Amino acid sequence: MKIEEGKLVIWINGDKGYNGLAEVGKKFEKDTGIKVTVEHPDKLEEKFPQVAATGDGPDIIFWAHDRFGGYAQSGLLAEITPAAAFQDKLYPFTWDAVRYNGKLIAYPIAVEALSLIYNKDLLPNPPKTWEEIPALDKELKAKGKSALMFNLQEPYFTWPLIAADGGYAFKYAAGKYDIKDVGVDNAGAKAGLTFLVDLIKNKHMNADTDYSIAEAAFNKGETAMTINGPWAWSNIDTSAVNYGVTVLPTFKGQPSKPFVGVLSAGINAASPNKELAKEFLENYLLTDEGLEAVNKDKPLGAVALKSYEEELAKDPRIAATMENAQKGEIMPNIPQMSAFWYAVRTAVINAASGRQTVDAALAAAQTNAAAASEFEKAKINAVRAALLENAHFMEKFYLQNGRFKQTSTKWPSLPIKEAEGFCIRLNGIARGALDSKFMLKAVAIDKDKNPFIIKMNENLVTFICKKSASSCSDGLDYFKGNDKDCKLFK
Ligand SMILES: OC[C@H]1O[C@H](O[C@H]2[C@H](O)[C@@H](O)[C@@H](O[C@H]3[C@H](O)[C@@H](O)[C@@H](O)O[C@@H]3CO)O[C@@H]2CO)[C@H](O)[C@@H](O)[C@@H]1O
Numbered sequence: 001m002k003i004e005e006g007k008l009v010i011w012i013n014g015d016k017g018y019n020g021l022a023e024v025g026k027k028f029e030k031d032t033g034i035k036v037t038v039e040h041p042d043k044l045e046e047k048f049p050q051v052a053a054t055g056d057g058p059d060i061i062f063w064a065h066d067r068f069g070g071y072a073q074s075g076l077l078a079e080i081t082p083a084a085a086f087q088d089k090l091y092p093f094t095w096d097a098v099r100y101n102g103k104l105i106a107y108p109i110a111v112e113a114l115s116l117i118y119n120k121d122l123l124p125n126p127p128k129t130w131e132e133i134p135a136l137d138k139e140l141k142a143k144g145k146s147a148l149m150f151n152l153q154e155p156y157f158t159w160p161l162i163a164a165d166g167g168y169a170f171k172y173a174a175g176k177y178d179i180k181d182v183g184v185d186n187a188g189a190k191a192g193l194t195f196l197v198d199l200i201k202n203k204h205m206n207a208d209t210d211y212s213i214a215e216a217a218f219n220k221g222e223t224a225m226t227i228n229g230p231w232a233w234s235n236i237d238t239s240a241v242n243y244g245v246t247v248l249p250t251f252k253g254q255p256s257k258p259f260v261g262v263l264s265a266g267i268n269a270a271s272p273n274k275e276l277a278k279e280f281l282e283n284y285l286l287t288d289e290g291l292e293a294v295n296k297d298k299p300l301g302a303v304a305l306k307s308y309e310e311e312l313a314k315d316p317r318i319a320a321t322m323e324n325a326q327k328g329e330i331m332p333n334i335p336q337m338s339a340f341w342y343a344v345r346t347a348v349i350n351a352a353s354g355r356q357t358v359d360a361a362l363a364a365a366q367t368n369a370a371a372a373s374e375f376e377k378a379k380i381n382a383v384r385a386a387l388l389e390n391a392h393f394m395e396k397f398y399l400q401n402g403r404f405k406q407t408s409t410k411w412p413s414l415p416i417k418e419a420e421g422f423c424i425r426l427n428g429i430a431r432g433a434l435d436s437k438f439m440l441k442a443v444a445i446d447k448d449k450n451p452f453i454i455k456m457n458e459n460l461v462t463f464i465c466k467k468s469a470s471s472c473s474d475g476l477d478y479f480k481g482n483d484k485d486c487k488l489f490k
């Protein structure tokens, strides 16, 4: 159950250079005696918050930075505090990708963007526009080939087209990503997904194509182009394909806008090996030799470490990666990114299969992306459970005393005064309060992490309110005052 002291367990995705990373772990063990176990479990980014919530999981978790705000909201990550001399060794924008509510919550490793990858023997002059792909596919179909195959099961790969003409995830305004301003169903997003769906309708792509299908077709010379990231180049090198890496096609005259990911390494808040983890990441991995060992296994892309990036930048494939990154933008790291991705995944699959029109698929995704996160819903349920336990006490107290108040100016002391990061009190001053009614109110101790209050009456009718000035630190035994932006709990 508990993480073992005196060892490092690392999780990293199966498309990355995990054998190269294990070589870094071997060097760490030679120098320190500390064994390093690198694992690449399936769905590691979903497993981590499940097991880390209980104090389990790896010491170190690797993923793109977009997952990390959610992990931090759940209290799963240790704060990262590099010395200034170390911080200056990495590009500032990579630290900003892993900065959440003022704190660094991971070490940045590498900067990833998708590029267009093309077979130079089939296609010495690849297209500059998406619009010319249908004609090109027709020519290649006459030769027993196809123009383009890429993973249609993951929204990461289709997003650059959706974003090109105006799609966006969350608008950045007034100094934050605004989770109420989602750009998934505007005209530009609809234009881009419509074009992808048109390609499928016209048999230029097949809706069922996934990562392995598209990789095999490209690496076997059956399709002229694919869309993928630097991690994919290793398997192409093994193949007989002479490939180039270039800027993504434009759509309606505008660049495709890939979402740029920073592969990042966080430290589990429950790890008893935090100082060893920091030494591994700072002094072994984030060095020219450490990144090289990973890069030799599967290319990292551009790296966050300035010294090594100066070498990698001379590789034309890295120059092309950077060109596409410059036309995209950094993913937000905020907790809501999970809801955004799951929503767009379903939309693309549904529109591409014909199960829904583009308009209906994206209208649903727009709603789902802005809807209450899984964290918020779980928190509300868990806080409500604590309210129910206190309500049970209130009814026990009532039977014992004939009223809900202890005295005319004092409420009885509750059995569950804190739960799930909320303080819980009776709501309303006791003076003049009626004898056969009560209200319980739960307020967050950390109101940036849990920006809502929950209140419940004696018959368990519950409201969630997003605006309240109440504070758990005000030194009082009750709450008073009105809440705003309230909605019935169902
Ligand atoms: O689609 C469901 C999927 O949504 C979320 O996954 C997203 C990743 O969080 C995001 O980083 C990006 O993933 C790509 C990696 O950055 C890249 O290094 C490489 O591994 O390819 C990945 C894409 O397959 O985009 C995906 C969305 O496609 C969410 O975190 C997942 O739990 C969920 O399964």
Ligand code: NA
Pocket: 081, 082, 083, 084, 086, 282
């Ligand atoms: Na340091």
Ligand code: NA
Pocket: 079, 080, 081, 102, 103, 104, 105
């Ligand atoms: Na910090």
Ligand code: NA
Pocket: 175, 176, 177, 334
């Ligand atoms: Na923000």
Ligand code: NA
Pocket: 230, 295, 299, 300, 301, 302, 312, 318
């Ligand atoms: Na690289």
Ligand code: NA
Pocket: 318, 319, 320, 322, 323
């Ligand atoms: Na470039």
